[PDB]
Every structure is written in structure tokens, then in C-alpha cells.
Design a protein around this ligand. Sequence first.
Ligand SMILES: Nc1cc(Cl)c(S(N)(=O)=O)cc1S(N)(=O)=O
Ligand SMILES: Nc1cc(Cl)c(S(N)(=O)=O)cc1S(N)(=O)=O
Ligand SMILES: [Zn+2]
Ligand SMILES: [Zn+2]
Lengths: 257, 257
Amino acid sequence: HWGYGKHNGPEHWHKDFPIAKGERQSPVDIDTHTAKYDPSLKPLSVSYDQATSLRILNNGHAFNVEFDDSQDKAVLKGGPLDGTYRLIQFHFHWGSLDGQGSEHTVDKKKYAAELHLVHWNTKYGDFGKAVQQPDGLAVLGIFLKVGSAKPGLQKVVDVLDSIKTKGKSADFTNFDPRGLLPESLDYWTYPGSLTTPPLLECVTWIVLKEPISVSSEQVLKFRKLNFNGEGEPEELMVDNWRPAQPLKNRQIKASFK
Amino acid sequence: HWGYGKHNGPEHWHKDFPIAKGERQSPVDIDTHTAKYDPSLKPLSVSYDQATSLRILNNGHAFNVEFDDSQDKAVLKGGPLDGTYRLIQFHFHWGSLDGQGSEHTVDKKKYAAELHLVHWNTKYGDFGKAVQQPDGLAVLGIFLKVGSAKPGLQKVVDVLDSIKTKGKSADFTNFDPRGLLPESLDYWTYPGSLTTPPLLECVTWIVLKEPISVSSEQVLKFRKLNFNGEGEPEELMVDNWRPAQPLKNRQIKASFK
Ligand SMILES: Nc1cc(Cl)c(S(N)(=O)=O)cc1S(N)(=O)=O
Ligand SMILES: Nc1cc(Cl)c(S(N)(=O)=O)cc1S(N)(=O)=O
Ligand SMILES: [Zn+2]
Ligand SMILES: [Zn+2]
């Protein structure tokens, strides 16, 4: 029964998931002056041309847009990564107000929301096996700020009415995640973890420097979702972000000067 | 985006909810000289000894005090009712000034506010199924006039600061709704509807004749609530009442002579 409230939120998670106090937890604050440029990092390769989305699900804390990951259709490669990582799902974290919502921060700046594109390393065969490995996942993180609308996001926001409450799903085919990417692929990278329970330390984080812009009306529709099931008292799905965790013995690398 | 303003208030609701012009809409004016005494009505049975409140919520138009309705703990029976109705929530409607705020009127008299205790018929299993039935709900309505304070109301007014804006909730356990009841259970009854969208024609209305008294300071605290979300321009939550609707082919019955 973990969640984001006073009695079950991030400060409680360590009781059920002791790794919450581990050595490579996420998210973190990105200190842009301390991050070091690494000229040995390769360009990021984001190959989403054959992506095939299947479904969208309200899982009780956010919503996941799911993909067919049974062949290499949508893959992340290059950058800090060795080998091939297949897209399985994306989701967001967001706030109750525009001044908060992101998980990562940039010189302590919080964005209104953060998009996570989750990928698993094909050398481990399946997602479930991959999360047991220190290099099992690669998450592409993208900040959202409020300003102009993101056209490529509108098909997501218009389906949210149909998955308002916990446990609802809807068909969501033919969704192109390329419409959620900023112009630049300039990034920061560090070794970390899932930001939700079970908090497994299996993620290579790749956080893009350039935010995308979404409109106030688009993020308002996120905030009309519900944490609760149908027929239960309404609890708006807002503030589903974990705050920054201690960097400990890690270095954040920059792909750019 | 229905509400109570000039451009989205009760006179607009029929566009989205055509039943607003239906044959059994609420509230109504209670013409006390036309209501007929029915000696075949049984005494009302209000059994609230085991009620267990859980939470209070600002839903953007009023606030709801919610109950655990997963067993028969707080039930309404008798009167005009067949079977057992379980308490799910209560809320109020109120005005900007003491001369208005009630939904029902009594010989055209408007009270400062009106309390609605909402109950669903256990034969339909859940609230959501109950509102689809002509005998699905029973609402106990109680008028508020301004005079002496209502001691049993003060725990509600003191929590309102913590739910000032739309979408906020707070724990609200151990609240006894018996402290909101007048001495007499003398009532009027008629078949009607929800008074808010979706305006479903599923309610047996039971309106008590005896008002309760609340102090000016108590109703002032209702009027400090906000329709708006946090960080938005302030719009005081006042005048959240629907005016009287046409009686059409209905009879109001009185439990008393
Ligand atoms: N399965 C999963 C995997 C990752 Cl990697 C992440 S996150 N937030 O670390 O990207 C979140 C989730 S989920 N669906 O529990 O929110
Ligand atoms: N759910 C509900 C049920 C009833 Cl019955 C009524 S009322 N005003 O008819 O009592 C009001 C509401 S609510 N929460 O939308 O204001
Ligand atoms: Zn995430
Ligand atoms: Zn009401």
C-alpha cells in the first residue's frame, strides 16, 4: 500500500523496500556546474520508427502507455549504453501546481512534470530478468514545462477520461512517441534506480537537457486523474514524484560542453 | 465545466444534462398549505450510532464529509421508504448572504443553508448502481438558519481551512452526524432528483420541518472556501444552490398535522 500521501509516501517506502536508503537511488539533483563533460560518450540513438503502442493503463499512481516489446521495434542505443535496450512503456510524474512535479531537478529547479521512457537490455531476455541486473534498464527522462501545447501529447490527454480511476485500461494503438521528444538529444547520465517501489538499482538514467513545452490545459487533464478506484472517494492523482535522493559515490556525466 | 456562475450555472445545465427539464427535478418549493398529511407514513428511523466518517473533500462546488458505507453502520429506514438506505456522505449548499442559500424553500422562504445527508438503497449493492434506479437514493434535508451556534458543527467548520481549494481533502474520522439533527423528525417527502449534475431522477427527498441554528461565524467560514484550485485566482465558494424547479405531476406529503 505504498503511495504518495502523508502516511504512505516516499519517506515511508524504506520500511517495505530497504534499498530506498541504498547507494544508487533516483532521482537526484543535477548540479550542472559539477557534471563533467565526457567526450568519450557517443551520440544517443533513439530509433522509434517502428514502435507499436498497445494500451494505456491507470495503475493507481500514474498511467503507463505500453508497447509491444516482443521484437526489436523501438530501441535505445549509444550514449553511455552498451548493447540494445527495448522500449516497454512510458509514463509521467507531475505536480498539483506548475512549480513542482519533476523527479530530477536541475540546479534545484523543479519542472512541472517529467516523462520517463523505460527500456530493458535485450541481453537479459525479459523485463523481469533485466530489473535484477545493474545494467538492466535505461530510462530516457524528459522535463515538461508549461507554455505552448505539445501537439504530439494531445492523443494521450484525450484518452485520460476513459482511464480516470485505478485499474482502468484502454486500447491505445498507433501512438508515435517521437512526438514527445525535444529537438536536442544533449543529456546528462548517471547510474541509479527505479523511482517507484521496488526501487531496484538497475537503471542507467539518461536525462535530456532540453525540456518540452506542454499547455496548461494539457497538464490540467493529468491532474483530473484519480488515485482511487471507481466508486471510491476521489483523491486527485497529483504529486506522484519522489524527491531528490543523496548522490553518494556517483558522478553525473554530460554529453555536451 | 458546470458550476454556479453566470455562464455555467443552473440555467445552463440542461445543455449537457437534458434531464434538467425532466418530470421529477429537485429542489422544489414546499407549499405547506398544499402538502397533505399522510397518516400512513411511518416514523422516520435515523440510526447513526455506528457511523464512521473517514474524510472531508473540497470537490470544487461544495465539500463532502464521507463515510464508510461498506457495511450497514449508519442507516435511514421507515418514513416513506421501503428497505434500508446507507449513509455515504453529507454536504451543504449555502449563500453569499443570510437571506439565501437553501435549495428547497418553504412557502417561498429561503434559508441561509441546507444540509443534505445522502443515502443509497442497499438492494442495489453500490451507490453507482443505485443512482440508476428511481428509488435508489434517500436524501435527508435539513435547513440552517443563523442564530445560536450549532456545537456539533464546529468540528466541520474548524477543518475547512485545510481544504480551502478544489481537490483538497483531509482525514475526518470520528465525526458524529447526530450532532447536526434538529429535535423533531417531522418531515415533508416527495420524489425528485439530484440537485447537481448529473441531475439523475433517483431520489426520495425527506425534508425536515425544523431548521437547525448555526452562528454567523460558522456560516462565514463556509463562505471563505474557494471554488478554484490552489494557486488560481480566488472565487469564493458561495451561492452553490440550485433554485426551485417546477413541481409538475407531483404531490408533497407531510408526516405531521
Ligand atoms: N515499471 C517501472 C519502471 C521504471 Cl524504470 C520506473 S521509473 N519511474 O524509474 O522510470 C517506473 C515504473 S512504474 N510503472 O512502477 O511507475
Ligand atoms: N453525489 C451527490 C448526490 C446527491 Cl443526492 C446530491 S444532492 N444535492 O441531490 O443531495 C449531491 C451530490 S454531490 N456530491 O455532486 O454534490
Ligand atoms: Zn518514472
Ligand atoms: Zn445537496
